[PDB]
Structures are given as structure tokens and as C-alpha cells.
UniProtKB/Swiss-Prot annotation:
Lineage, highest ranks first: Eukaryota, Metazoa, Chordata, Craniata, Vertebrata
Cellular compartments per GO CC: cytoplasm; cytosol; nuclear replication fork; nucleoplasm; nucleus; protein-containing complex; RNA polymerase II transcription regulator complex
Subunit structure: Homodimer. Interacts with NR1H4. Interacts with SNRPC. Interacts with the C-terminus of NCOA2/GRIP1, NCO3/ACTR and NCOA1/SRC1. Part of a complex consisting of CARM1, EP300/P300 and NCOA2/GRIP1. Interacts with FLII, TP53, myogenic factor MEF2, EP300/P300, TRIM24, CREBBP and CTNNB1. Interacts with RELA. Identified in a complex containing CARM1, TRIM24 and NCOA2/GRIP1. Interacts with NCOA3/SRC3. Interacts with SKP2. Interacts (via PH domain-like fold) with C9orf72. Interacts with PARP1; promoting PARP1 recruimtent to replication forks.
Cross-link (Glycyl lysine isopeptide (Lys-Gly) (interchain with G-Cter in ubiquitin)): K82
Phosphoserine modification, residue list: S71
Reactions this protein catalyses: L-arginyl-[protein] + 2 S-adenosyl-L-methionine = N(omega),N(omega)-dimethyl-L-arginyl-[protein] + 2 S-adenosyl-L-homocysteine + 2 H(+)
Protein name: Histone-arginine methyltransferase CARM1
Positions of region (Required for nuclear translocation): 201-234
Length: 332
């Protein structure tokens, strides 16, 4: 009968642990397949995950690895380094990359691309700051980030927002009339990004792609990310919002490998979300839907998404503004 849960607390303790196993799993494979980018190289591992990528860098044959991390997590790493006999190969240095000091330049900077690296500008800044240690010939893991977006139709998803508000704000509430808050409540429900599994047949155009290259990214490039778009509509009907998916890649010398689950035919993205428009747009097949997404870092450690959209043939316009801090998982 359909339920909304906070995406960040949804999984059990075991499920969260199983999920770190699976994902670090795909990082190890990526590092091993590209062992040539690590063999006899100097590596800088930047913060969090308890140094585990450094162990993959070592497995792949790195000469020396600097692992930089906050002092609590650093002691656990220091324990792991010793008991795995890698004291000659991994140097754990407690602190922040900006105020810490390395005795040499590095060939590769690595960082574990969990959700809370990708949606937190503090983590991204540090990752970029670490390039001060990278040789001109150097590389980064991950190397690039893709955002894909596509419009979707989903009547049920959009009308649920009304049925939640109607249910709670129309009937009196222990003798108190709350109906004057109905509109404010609906407007707030529309600003809740939704994580879901949905069947691609609801997409109404081919996706548009936007690439961030971390290797070439300057100071402050990730504060504000402008994505203009023009979709050529393949289906007629109501566009209720935009669907987003996020992917990182390591462009090695051997093999470009995607690290949020990969493309060749239809399968599953670890990092996806749908954002509703406040008002749906009608488009004919063959029409164009254009506008812009702004992703801006906010005061609360994530990004706001601004989406503006227009049907060119008709002038019709809708928009929305959402915070990605607390997506909801929609369980069907």
C-alpha cells in the first residue's frame, strides 16, 4: 500500500554492512583491473573508510601509500596496517589534507566515492585540495562524475503528495482546524526528493549527461553546478519531474571503469533520485523541453536542486527547489 521512509536510515545494521562489503568490493576490482596505474607508484588515500582503499592500492603493488585521515579513524587504520604487515608500505598520517604534510609528491590520489563524498562539498573540496600533492603526470580515483537526467511521467507519485496533505490538513485535528496549512503542506511534500526503483518506460526522452572532471576541476568548481538541458520528447503526456542518476568513473591507462554500477545495457544505479515539479507540463512527442538545473551547496552539508523547465512550442513553464539532505525512499 506504499510507504515513505527516510532514505538514510532505512537499511538495517546488517544491510548497511553488507552494502559496504559489496561496494568496496567493486572498488577493489577496479583497482586490481588497473594494477598498472598502481604498480610501484606513490599513492595518496584521502580520508574515511578506515584506510581500506590503501590496502587495495597495496594489493595492486603500490610502492608507498600515504593514508590521510581524522585521528579517531586513523588509529584503527594504524592497527590494521600493523596487523597486515604493511608498515613499510602504508603510512597513516593523522589529520586534514590541507594542514597535513607529505614528504613527497604522488602519482595517484584515491578517495572512496560513497554517497557522502559525492553530496557533501566539504569532502569534495578536500579531494580537490589534495591535488596540490599530485605530479603533473598524476591521476585520480575517481576521475570523473556524471549526472544524467531525464523527464518522467508518474501521476501516482505526484497525486500522493496531495493525498498526504488532504488526509492530515482537511479533517479537524483534535478540534483544531488545520486546513489553512494544506497548501503549504502540499508545497513542502513536493520538495521531498524521492528514491525509488522505477521502470525506465516512464522516461519521456533520452537522458542528458553532465560530466565533472575532478582532475581538471579548479578551486570552487563544485560549489555551483549549472546543467542546461534540451530534451527532444519521444512520448506525449504529462511531465511530472526530472529523474537523476549519479556515477563516478576511474579512467585508468588500461580500462575506464564505472564505480556506481556500469553501462552496456539496462541495469541499476546506486545513486538515483526523482524530483517533482510543483505543476506538471504537457508536452507532445516531438516537442522540446528546455531549462536548467542548478545544484548549489547549502548551509546544511548537502546540495539544493533548482529545476526550471519550459515546453518551447507552447511557452508553458514549471519549476521546483529541493534539498537533497533527506531524500525519502518510496516503498511500494
Amino acid at each position: 500500500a506504499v510507504q515513505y521512509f527516510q532514505f538514510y536510515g532505512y537499511l538495517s545494521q546488517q544491510q548497511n554492512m553488507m552494502q559496504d562489503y559489496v561496494r568496496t568490493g567493486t572498488y577493489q576490482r577496479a583497482i586490481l583491473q588497473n594494477h598498472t596505474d598502481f604498480k610501484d607508484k606513490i599513492v595518496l588515500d584521502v580520508g574515511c573508510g578506515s584506510g581500506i582503499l590503501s590496502f587495495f592500492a597495496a594489493q595492486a603493488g603500490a610502492r608507498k601509500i600515504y593514508a590521510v585521515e581524522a585521528s579517531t579513524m586513523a588509529q584503527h587504520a594504524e592497527v590494521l596496517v600493523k596487523s597486515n604487515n604493511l608498515t613499510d608500505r602504508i603510512v597513516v598520517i593523522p589529520g586534514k589534507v590541507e594542514e597535513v604534510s607529505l614528504p613527497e609528491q604522488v602519482d595517484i590520489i584515491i578517495s572512496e566515492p560513497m554517497g557522502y563524498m559525492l553530496f557533501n562539498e566539504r569532502m569534495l573540496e578536500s579531494y580537490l585540495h589534495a591535488k596540490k600533492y599530485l605530479k603533473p603526470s598524476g591521476n585520480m580515483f575517481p576521475t570523473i562524475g556524471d549526472v544524467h537526467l531525464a523527464p518522467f511521467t508518474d501521476e501516482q507519485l505526484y497525486m500522493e503528495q496531495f493525498t498526504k496533505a488532504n488526509f492530515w490538513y482537511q479533517p479537524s485535528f483534535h478540534g483544531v482546524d488545520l486546513s489553512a496549512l494544506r497548501g503549504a503542506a502540499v508545497d513542502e511534500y513536493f520538495r521531498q526528493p524521492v528514491v525509488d526503483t522505477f521502470d525506465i518506460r516512464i522516461l519521456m526522452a533520452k537522458s542528458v549527461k553532465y560530466t565533472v572532471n575532478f582532475l581538471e576541476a579548479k578551486e570552487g568548481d563544485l560549489h555551483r553546478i549549472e546543467i542546461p538541458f534540451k530534451f527532444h520528447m519521444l512520448h506525449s503526456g504529462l511531465v511530472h519531474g526530472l529523474a537523476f542518476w549519479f556515477d563516478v568513473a576511474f579512467i585508468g591507462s588500461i580500462m575506464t571503469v564505472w564505480l556506481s554500477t556500469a553501462p552496456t545495457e539496462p541495469l541499476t544505479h546506486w545513486y538515483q533520485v526523482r524530483c517533482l515539479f510543483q505543476s506538471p507540463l504537457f508536452a507532445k512527442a516531438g516537442d522540446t523541453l528546455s531549462g536548467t538545473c542548478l545544484l548549489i551547496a547549502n548551509k546544511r552539508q548537502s546540495y539544493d536542486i533548482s529545476i526550471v523547465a519550459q515546453v518551447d512550442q507552447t511557452g508553458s513553464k514549471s519549476s521546483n527547489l529541493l534539498d537533497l539532505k533527506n531524500p525519502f525512499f518510496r516503498y511500494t
